[PDB]
Design an enzyme around this catalytic site. Structure first.
Site, PDB file in Angstrom:
ATOM      1  N   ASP A  88      91.621  43.437  18.380  1.00  0.00           N
ATOM      2  CA  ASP A  88      90.598  42.395  18.181  1.00  0.00           C
ATOM      3  C   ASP A  88      89.949  42.013  19.486  1.00  0.00           C
ATOM      4  O   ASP A  88      90.466  41.206  20.285  1.00  0.00           O
ATOM      5  CB  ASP A  88      91.200  41.165  17.471  1.00  0.00           C
ATOM      6  CG  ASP A  88      90.167  40.117  17.101  1.00  0.00           C
ATOM      7  OD1 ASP A  88      88.946  40.356  17.344  1.00  0.00           O
ATOM      8  OD2 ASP A  88      90.566  39.079  16.489  1.00  0.00           O
TER       9      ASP A  88
HETATM   10  C1  2NC Z   1      85.464  33.048  15.596  1.00  0.00           C
HETATM   11  C2  2NC Z   1      86.305  32.968  16.893  1.00  0.00           C
HETATM   12  C3  2NC Z   1      86.140  34.318  17.627  1.00  0.00           C
HETATM   13  C4  2NC Z   1      86.500  35.548  16.817  1.00  0.00           C
HETATM   14  C5  2NC Z   1      87.885  35.598  16.176  1.00  0.00           C
HETATM   15  C6  2NC Z   1      88.134  36.898  15.388  1.00  0.00           C
HETATM   16  N1  2NC Z   1      89.355  36.978  14.795  1.00  0.00           N
HETATM   17  C7  2NC Z   1      89.588  37.727  13.541  1.00  0.00           C
HETATM   18  C8  2NC Z   1      91.092  37.727  13.187  1.00  0.00           C
HETATM   19  C9  2NC Z   1      91.483  38.388  11.879  1.00  0.00           C
HETATM   20  C10 2NC Z   1      91.883  37.371  10.848  1.00  0.00           C
HETATM   21  C11 2NC Z   1      93.197  36.647  11.230  1.00  0.00           C
HETATM   22  C12 2NC Z   1      88.783  37.113  12.396  1.00  0.00           C
HETATM   23  O1  2NC Z   1      88.727  35.917  12.207  1.00  0.00           O
HETATM   24  N2  2NC Z   1      88.211  37.965  11.572  1.00  0.00           N
HETATM   25  C13 2NC Z   1      87.468  37.531  10.409  1.00  0.00           C
HETATM   26  C14 2NC Z   1      86.008  37.243  10.761  1.00  0.00           C
HETATM   27  C15 2NC Z   1      85.159  36.803   9.553  1.00  0.00           C
HETATM   28  C16 2NC Z   1      84.600  37.969   8.764  1.00  0.00           C
HETATM   29  N3  2NC Z   1      84.218  37.746   7.534  1.00  0.00           N
HETATM   30  O2  2NC Z   1      84.481  39.071   9.286  1.00  0.00           O
HETATM   31  C17 2NC Z   1      87.613  38.545   9.288  1.00  0.00           C
HETATM   32  O3  2NC Z   1      87.523  39.755   9.495  1.00  0.00           O
HETATM   33  N4  2NC Z   1      87.857  38.030   8.091  1.00  0.00           N
HETATM   34  C18 2NC Z   1      88.135  38.820   6.919  1.00  0.00           C
HETATM   35  C19 2NC Z   1      89.560  38.535   6.461  1.00  0.00           C
HETATM   36  C20 2NC Z   1      90.609  39.412   7.186  1.00  0.00           C
HETATM   37  C21 2NC Z   1      91.222  40.515   6.249  1.00  0.00           C
HETATM   38  N5  2NC Z   1      90.248  41.513   5.789  1.00  0.00           N
HETATM   39  C22 2NC Z   1      90.500  42.793   5.518  1.00  0.00           C
HETATM   40  N6  2NC Z   1      91.717  43.351   5.641  1.00  0.00           N
HETATM   41  N7  2NC Z   1      89.507  43.551   5.110  1.00  0.00           N
HETATM   42  C23 2NC Z   1      87.140  38.393   5.867  1.00  0.00           C
HETATM   43  N8  2NC Z   1      86.469  39.297   5.142  1.00  0.00           N
HETATM   44  O4  2NC Z   1      86.983  37.196   5.604  1.00  0.00           O
HETATM   45  N9  2NC Z   1      88.885  35.292  17.184  1.00  0.00           N
HETATM   46  C24 2NC Z   1      89.855  34.432  16.934  1.00  0.00           C
HETATM   47  O5  2NC Z   1      90.029  33.939  15.823  1.00  0.00           O
HETATM   48  C25 2NC Z   1      90.744  34.053  18.120  1.00  0.00           C
HETATM   49  N10 2NC Z   1      90.174  32.952  18.828  1.00  0.00           N
HETATM   50  C26 2NC Z   1      89.836  33.042  20.113  1.00  0.00           C
HETATM   51  O6  2NC Z   1      89.982  34.076  20.749  1.00  0.00           O
HETATM   52  C27 2NC Z   1      89.269  31.802  20.810  1.00  0.00           C
HETATM   53  N11 2NC Z   1      88.962  30.627  19.963  1.00  0.00           N
HETATM   54  C28 2NC Z   1      87.751  30.193  19.596  1.00  0.00           C
HETATM   55  C29 2NC Z   1      87.728  28.872  18.881  1.00  0.00           C
HETATM   56  O7  2NC Z   1      86.719  30.667  20.066  1.00  0.00           O
HETATM   57  C30 2NC Z   1      90.264  31.446  21.909  1.00  0.00           C
HETATM   58  C31 2NC Z   1      89.649  30.374  22.845  1.00  0.00           C
HETATM   59  O8  2NC Z   1      91.484  30.961  21.333  1.00  0.00           O
HETATM   60  C32 2NC Z   1      92.181  33.754  17.652  1.00  0.00           C
HETATM   61  C33 2NC Z   1      92.835  34.999  17.051  1.00  0.00           C
HETATM   62  C34 2NC Z   1      93.070  33.222  18.798  1.00  0.00           C
HETATM   63  C35 2NC Z   1      93.282  34.220  19.932  1.00  0.00           C
END
Ligand code: 2NC
Length: 203
Positions: A129
């Protein structure tokens, strides 16, 4: 370009005639941008992240220029903390993840970039990620001292235990550093360890 991960992979994008900053996010399925007006019909959707679920507006077939490379695809608009370019558009601009500057495995982004890691004597699957500052591993009885931390992303925050100087093998590459343990849906390898294995984005 080839982009290393010592800092957040932030780029300028053009969307709806306007310039924005966004993070190249291999851990995101989709592209999510902060509230703004877009020319188009949209439909309501829910998406999830580390902190839970949020409601967004789905716009289809939106042209987006990403550091000069053209994409046309789905853009979700909603209360994301950071604008993120996810795999749906990264694939369009030919973005891959590469280890050791291209001498190691190449990972395409057609599907989630899941790899095998070893931590605490256990093998686990984890998501590479580039949108994660830190590494977050699912509840695991890691021995050691630790301090509480809260980490956030889409949906809000979770409480985790921060452990330092934990050895972690990632696809056969050794790394050592800070690991956060808590209730995540997916184990996430973040930039703190990706840099140690020479991971770059390339397109
Ligand atoms: C928005 C903040 C920046 C991007 C985000 C991307 N992380 C992934 C992690 C995977 C889920 C736990 C994510 O949320 N992905 C989502 C993004 C939304 C999207 N629709 O693409 C996703 O793919 N979601 C899928 C669900 C996951 C499963 N899907 C699958 N297997 N197909 C979805 N469709 O809803 N990063 C984070 O969440 C990280 N945050 C950060 O790095 C920073 N925080 C902030 C607030 O900026 C740092 C200061 O802590 C977390 C992990 C802490 C280190």
């Amino acid at each position: 370009p080839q982009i290393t991960l010592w800092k957040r992979p932030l780029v300028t994008i053009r969307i709806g005639g306007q310039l924005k900053e966004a993070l190249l996010d291999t851990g995101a399925d989709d592209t999510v941008i902060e509230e703004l007006n877009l020319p188009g019909c949209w439909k309501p959707k829910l998406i999830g992240g580390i902190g839970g679920f949020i409601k967004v507006r789905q716009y289809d077939q939106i042209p987006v220029e990403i550091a000069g490379h053209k994409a046309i695809g789905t853009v979700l608009v909603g209360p994301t903390p950071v604008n993120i370019i996810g795999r749906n558009l990264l694939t369009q601009i030919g973005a891959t993840l590469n280890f050791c500057g291209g001498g190691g495995p190449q990972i395409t982004l057609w599907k989630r970039p899941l790899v095998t890691i070893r931590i605490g004597g256990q093998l686990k699957e984890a998501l590479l990620d580039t949108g994660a500052d830190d590494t977050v591993i699912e509840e695991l009885n890691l021995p050691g001292c630790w301090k509480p931390k809260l980490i956030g992303g889409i949906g809000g925050f979770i409480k985790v235990r921060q452990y330092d100087q934990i050895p972690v093998e990632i696809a056969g590459h050794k790394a050592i550093g800070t690991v956060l343990v808590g209730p995540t849906p997916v184990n996430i390898i973040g930039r703190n360890l990706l840099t140690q294995i020479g991971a770059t984005l390339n397109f």
